[PDB]
Amino acid sequence: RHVVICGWSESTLECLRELRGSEVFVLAEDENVRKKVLRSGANFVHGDPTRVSDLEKANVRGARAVIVDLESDSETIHCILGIRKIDESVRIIAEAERYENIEQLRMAGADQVISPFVISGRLMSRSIDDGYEAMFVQDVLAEESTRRMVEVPIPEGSKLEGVSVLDADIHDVTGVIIIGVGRGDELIIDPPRDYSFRAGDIILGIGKPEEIERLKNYI
Amino acid sequence: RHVVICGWSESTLECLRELRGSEVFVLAEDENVRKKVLRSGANFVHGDPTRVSDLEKANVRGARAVIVDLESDSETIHCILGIRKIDESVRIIAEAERYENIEQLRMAGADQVISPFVISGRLMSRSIDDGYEAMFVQDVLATRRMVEVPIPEGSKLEGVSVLDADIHDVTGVIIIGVGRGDELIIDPPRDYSFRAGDIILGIGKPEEIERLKNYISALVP
Ligand SMILES: [Ca+2]
Ligand SMILES: [Ca+2]
């Protein structure tokens, strides 16, 4: 389908770059960003992210997801309320500028809130002696990285359905390091050898392209 | 030792929550942030982070590290230059508001640059279907968290390989990578050989982390 981005910022620019090859619509009030937006691989809709009519024009209804990052947390929350009037099921991902506004965004309808400064501050605290942890985080989240983090869903009828982590022996078989399994609303990091996989489970792993393809085929 | 923070923002506020117990000096020009800075646990120094005299009284010389986060790109650069006039080796970690200034920051002397909007933008792109990757980055940076453990001189594993070390089964800590020199080796091969100085990046619970520390300690009287 398509993804809709509300607001044009250093965060949303990086997001668009990472969605290369995907259809994207960017909705913003500053008409001067159209060229960069087009060059960046997306369609640009000039409008107000807090206005239902404009959110509808940017094709919010039925979108795979809507990403929101307006200049202010107050503007961001108004946009979320607006999206929910159009599609109460579409996934909404919003950026919070200040920690004190996170819950407000969730209440408005955000399914996920990303707080750049909370992540940066935590990384700052972990970088007093060296920068390996920050390096790890920034790199595995990049689609272009040689060894990156991938999400692989366990399809219905998978050979691993009902199979334990131990028996799946994924790392030796694929080369992919399993960091966690997403099931329902939670994430199980380093699942016990006992853990039994289920269809619908999301395997979070790290590996090179080759190893990733192997995991997909294995799964 | 002690850590110095230049400037004040939501990022340094969060950093402080993480550095509790450690001695921290915050140097900032807007006197309006003094209240919050003291409540966060840091000693406050009102001054110009771009001025050598103010950086010196904030204890930059000999610090463990200096974290720099100023709104101005130019000011961040000026701050780094000031730090380098005082201490040529102290670790400098700077925040970049815009991707385009990352290299100017390194040119000035920053050892590391953190780009909040790059990390956020990538997480946005990875969160289209679900939020597990974001859930990961959160749960690990704050039962199980990511940790760095240095291989000491004369360490038991100093010379042993990943296959032989079988650290995950022995400690329960999952090894996500090894830091050596200035390169990070993610998921070290079976043939990889631990060396003194290496930094092991792992995810585990406090007890599993402790097991790793002892499994890695040096054989010294
Ligand atoms: Ca933003
Ligand atoms: Ca900042």
> Could you say which ligand is closest to the alpha carbon of residue A97?
1
Distance, in Å, from the CA atom of B121 to the CA atom of B126, rounded to the nearest integer, reads 9
* Nearest residue, CB atoms, A136 vs list B15, B138, B184: B184
DSSP state of A160: T
CA closest to B12 among chain A residues: A121
Contact A127/B112 with Cβ under 8 angstroms?
A: yes
Contact A50/A75 with Cβ under 8 angstroms?
A: yes
Q: Report the CATH fold assignment for A1-115.
A: Rossmann fold (3.40.50)
> Does the domain formed by B116-142 have CATH 1.20.5.870?
yes
- For residue A14, report the distance from its CA to the centre of ligand 1, in Å: 11
Q: Which chain A residues contact residue B67 at CB under 8 A?
A: 124, 127
> Could you say which ligand is closest to the alpha carbon of residue A124?
2
- For residue A62, report the distance from its CA to the centre of ligand 2, in Å: 35
The answer on whether B97 is annotated among ligand-binding residues is: yes
Residue A7, burial from CB neighbour count under 10 angstroms (0-12, 13-18, 19+): buried
Q: How many CB pairs under 8 A join A and B?
A: 237
Q: Report the CATH fold assignment for B143-221.
A: Alpha-Beta Plaits (3.30.70)
Contact B136/B144 with Cβ under 8 angstroms?
A: no
> Could you say which ligand is closest to the alpha carbon of residue B94?
2
Contact B63/B90 with Cβ under 8 angstroms?
A: yes
In CATH terms, A116-143 corresponds, of 3.90.1150.10, 2.40.110.10, 1.20.5.870, 1.10.10.10, to: 1.20.5.870
Disruptive mutation site among B4, B68, B126 for chain A (greatest number of A CBs within 10 Å): B126
- The class that CATH gives domain A144-219 is alpha beta
Domain residue ranges of chain A, discontinuous segments joined by +: 1-115, 116-143, 144-219
Resolution in angstroms comes to 1.7
Q: Which chain A residues contact residue B110 at CB under 8 A?
A: none
Q: Within 10 A of A31 (CB to CB), how many other CB atoms are there?
A: 9
Query: Does B179 contact A114 at a Cβ distance shorter than 8 Å?
Result: no
Please state the φ and ψ torsions of residue B146, each to the nearest 5 degrees. Answer: -85, 140
- For residue A217, report the distance from its CA to the centre of ligand 2, in Å: 43
Q: Which chain B residues contact residue A12 at CB under 8 A?
A: 121, 124
Contact B20/B50 with Cβ under 8 angstroms?
A: no
Of chain A, the end-to-end C-alpha distance in Å amounts to 24
Distance, in Å, from the CA atom of A207 to the CA atom of A174, rounded to the nearest integer, reads 9
Please state the φ and ψ torsions of residue A211, each to the nearest 5 degrees. Answer: -65, -35
The answer on whether B182 is annotated among ligand-binding residues is: no
* Tokens linked to B31: 């006197």
Sheet with A3-6: strands ordered across: A43-46, A24-28, A3-6, A65-68, A91-95, A112-114
Distance, in Å, from the CA atom of B62 to the CA atom of B3, rounded to the nearest integer, reads 9
Distance, in Å, from the CA atom of B37 to the CA atom of B43, rounded to the nearest integer, reads 7
The residue type of B195 is: R
Q: By what technique were these coordinates determined?
A: X-ray
